[model samples]
Target: SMSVKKPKRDDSKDLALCSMILTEMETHEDAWPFLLPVNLKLVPGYKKVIKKPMDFSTIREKLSSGQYPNLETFALDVRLVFDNCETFNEDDSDIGRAGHNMRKYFEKKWTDTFK
Candidate 1:
């Protein structure tokens, strides 16, 4: 029989980081496009409700409740949030650089670690 090994990181820590990134993004709305439509495409129908304001508490609740199937899925959703932004660019303004950093952070800190 094969035994499955658990990841070293804590789920709550991952959720906390996710919340922090999202909260930072909220403060930079001027640099982002409307995220509702993009999130709708990723989540579909009823799940799109979570993107209404995209607050930290809502995201924390969803993450804690297993609304996201895995860290990759959550990362994809976060990538979409930035990817959909018309102003987001890796080589451009401060906000764009911040978005890029957030993506890389998610990849290194959560996605790669959890996977």
Candidate 2:
């Protein structure tokens, strides 16, 4: 009887949007530090400090496998990248500034696209 009614919202749209945002984040000029996982050999004890280390490549791989339930889940991982940076590097440190900048860029882009 309700066959004539319109379909529900397209969740796939968020899925697609997540992929798009990830690309922008990866290509971002100041996204170097967060682009890939930190080098354990280069930075000794990096393995111990951050229990979970996240990066663009890992997120992309997760996206490729269709792992996210929605934009919120993807956003969590994206934010995690920056959070890890903030913890690994001091606020005034070199990589630390880039971390903050990238976080700001993502947040603004996120708000602009979603809100």
Candidate 3:
């Protein structure tokens, strides 16, 4: 009997990571409500307790540190996009990543398209 090997490209781990990130984001006042009424109703809690909004800054700094959640990839990706697109001056904008540009561009495009 031939054994069936499932495709190796499982996104579960990444998806789980994303779910955790989303949970963390949603827990914050800034990101709550938007992700509410989730289908599963299961969300990961913050790895550490956050007493208040200022505590979120510490979470941000940790995320930026390229450890644990490894959000550095997001930062580096943005830097690469800014570097290639001459129209964007990285110095002028708070967005340091091309990914942000991509996200912003899509948001604008979609908003304009609907309008």
Clashes (N, CA, C under 3 Å) per candidate: 0, 0, 2
lDDT winner between 1 and 2, please give it.
2
Q: How many backbone overlaps does candidate 3 show?
A: 2
So what's the TM-score on candidate 2?
A: 0.87
Per-residue lDDT tens digits for candidate 2, residues 15-46, read 77878988898898988888777888898878
lDDT of 1 by residue, 1-78 (tens): 268776656665666666665555545544243333334455444253333334334445666687987656666666
Clashing pairs in 1: none
**Reference-based lDDT, residue 8, model 3:** 66
Tens digit of lDDT per residue, candidate 3, span 4-112? 8766654335434533553444353433222222222343332222212122233344444644343334334323332333233243444334324443543453344
lDDT of 2 at 8: 73
Q: What lDDT does the true structure give each of the candidates?
A: 0.53, 0.88, 0.36
| Model 1: residue 83 alpha-carbon error in angstroms | 3.7
Q: List runs of model 1 lying over 4 Å from the truth.
A: 4-7, 29-32, 38-65, 84-115
Candidate 2: list runs displaced more than 4 Å. 1-9
Question: What is the full ranking by lDDT, best candidate first?
Answer: 2, 1, 3
Candidate number achieving the greatest TM-score relative to the actual structure: 2
- What lDDT is obtained when candidate 3 is compared to the true structure? 0.36
